[PDB]
Design a protein around this ligand. Structure first.
Ligand SMILES: Nc1nc2c(ncn2[C@@H]2O[C@H](COP(=O)(O)OP(=O)(O)O)[C@@H](O)[C@H]2O)c(=O)[nH]1
Ligand SMILES: [Mg+2]
Ligand SMILES: [Mg+2]
Lengths: 69, 428
């Protein structure tokens, strides 16, 4: 009975400890997955606006030929 | 076989424990400060059974007060006899048990149990010859139920040759609306079958029905319920507290009352039934004490003794009366209702007569029956239990504290065995 009385209380610690563990992990994972996903969305936004900046130059550098002829 | 160590655990335990000490103190002529002021000397003959002596010849109860919250014990300490108890024998925590057997038996209670056993040990060394221990507690809560049974299991380890006695208050939906009490009770019973020699089954279903039906109290209070318990406890221990011939110590009582090690769950009765408001101007006749003390209305266990058979009976009469007439009426019941007594235990009814009556009465009779009808009580709890357990309801409170479903199944299984064992000898 004494051996069992210890097994029970150590089982309660192990389970409450592991709840803390899982929670701490599941949180850290979805908080990192969020940071990556948002940074990516911003990266692709900035990407599109920077290819409009080089298309804008291909227009300013297309006219610069037409003018001189 | 001289000194008894008393322990009271939890809310229910400390309330009835206190009331018990209130009563017998008055009977033994001990005042709240602990000095003696009584007439007869019968009061001081076996005073050493429940009390210690100190300087100034003050009498201190051999009692240990246990709880996991300070509530009830602060109230007891500011109660009537509050200052009588040994201040160091107050052992309480703060967390509480939350009516959870697991909290009381495995976690919150384990954190406190060692400190209690230190006070037990100190009292047990003061003993010239220790008989054993009597515990007072409920089986429906957490502290008294869970921590109480833990203390028993632990005490049996240090004192395996001593006698373990208990006043165990069985739960009833008529008194408590806490849904988990059947879990607590079933778990406790398992412990009690294994680790007690004597258990007085004080049923709150009985105490309520008695208060409401017989005593005509439309709104029974704990004080009303406890007045009955207090009266029963006084009577049941009378043979222990005053000079007598029968069942004069816990072991002798156990040998007379317990034909089989597991079947040690007694059915207490009392007469005349009294309320704190009742007048009781007219003392009862000896025949009246007898017809009532065997009447189901007077049983504190809420079982119909006509549904089973008496394995053993102890009957205690108090007050100045015709000891001649006591024997005739006692022999009358046995010979009238001979079918309800097992034939394979000859002369299973034993009687004692103490001259000093209980407080406020001239004539009183107390009943202690090892009836096989006690199974009805365990059957009741078993049904309340399975109703929930088949759907695994409310188990998360317990598994959260480290327990497992298997431990419930075993407790359920063992109490079902107890019921069947009580039935085995009922048809013998
Ligand atoms: N007769 C009686 N029963 C009580 C008393 N207090 C609680 N109970 C019963 O005990 C059960 C609750 O257990 P309780 O002692 O309050 O919990 P604990 O403090 O953890 O031991 C319920 O079934 C109540 O009916 C009391 O003062 N008198
Ligand atoms: Mg409470
Ligand atoms: Mg703690």
């Amino acid at each position: 009975k004494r051996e069992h009385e210890r097994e029970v209380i150590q089982k309660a610690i192990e389970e409450n400890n592991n709840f803390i563990k899982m929670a701490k992990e599941k949180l850290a994972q979805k908080m990192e997955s969020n940071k990556e996903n948002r940074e990516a969305h911003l990266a692709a936004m900035l990407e599109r606006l920077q290819e409009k900046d080089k298309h804008a130059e291909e227009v300013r550098k297309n006219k610069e030929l037409k003018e001189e002829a | 076989m001289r000194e008894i160590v008393h322990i009271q655990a939890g809310q229910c335990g400390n309330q009835i424990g206190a009331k018990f000490w209130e009563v017998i103190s008055d009977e033994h002529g001990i005042d709240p400060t602990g000095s003696y002021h009584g007439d007869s000397d019968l009061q001081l003959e076996r005073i050493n059974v429940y009390y210690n002596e100190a300087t100034g010849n003050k009498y201190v109860p051999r009692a240990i007060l246990v709880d996991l919250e300070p509530g009830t014990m602060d109230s007891v300490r500011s109660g009537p006899f509050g200052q009588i108890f040994r201040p160091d024998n107050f052992v309480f925590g703060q967390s509480g048990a939350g009516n959870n057997w697991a909290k009381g038996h495995y976690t919150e209670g384990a954190e406190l149990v060692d400190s209690v056993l230190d006070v037990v040990r100190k009292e047990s060394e003061s003993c010239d010859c220790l008989q054993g221990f009597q515990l007072t507690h409920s089986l429906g809560g957490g502290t008294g139920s869970g921590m109480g049974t833990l203390l028993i299991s632990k005490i049996r380890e240090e004192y395996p040759d001593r006698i373990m006695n208990t006043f165990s208050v069985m739960p009833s939906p008529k008194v408590s609306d806490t849904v988990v009490e059947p879990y607590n009770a079933t778990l406790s019973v398992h412990q009690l079958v294994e680790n007690t020699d004597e258990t007085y089954c004080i049923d709150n279903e009985a105490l309520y029905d008695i208060c409401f039906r017989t005593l005509k109290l439309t709104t029974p209070t704990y004080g009303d319920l406890n007045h009955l318990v207090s009266a029963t406890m006084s009577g049941v221990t009378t043979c222990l507290r005053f000079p007598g011939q029968l069942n004069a110590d816990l072991r002798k009582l156990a040998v007379n009352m317990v034909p089989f090690p597991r079947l040690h769950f007694f059915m207490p009765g009392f007469a005349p039934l009294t309320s704190r408001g009742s007048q009781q101007y007219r003392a009862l006749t000896v025949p009246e004490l007898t017809q009532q003390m065997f009447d189901s209305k007077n049983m504190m266990a809420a079982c119909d003794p006509r549904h089973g058979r008496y394995l053993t009976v102890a009957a205690i009469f108090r007050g100045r009366m015709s000891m001649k007439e006591v024997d005739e009426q006692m022999l009358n019941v046995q010979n009238k209702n001979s079918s309800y007594f097992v034939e394979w235990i000859p002369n299973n009814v034993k009687t004692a007569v103490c001259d000093i009556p209980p407080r406020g009465l001239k004539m009183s009779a107390t009943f202690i029956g090892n009836s096989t009808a006690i199974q009805e009580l365990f059957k009741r709890i078993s049904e309340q239990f399975t109703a929930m357990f088949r759907r695994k309801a409310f188990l998360h409170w317990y598994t959260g504290e480290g327990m497992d479903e298997m431990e419930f199944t075993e407790a359920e299984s063992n109490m079902n065995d107890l019921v069947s064992e009580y039935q085995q000898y009922q048809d013998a």
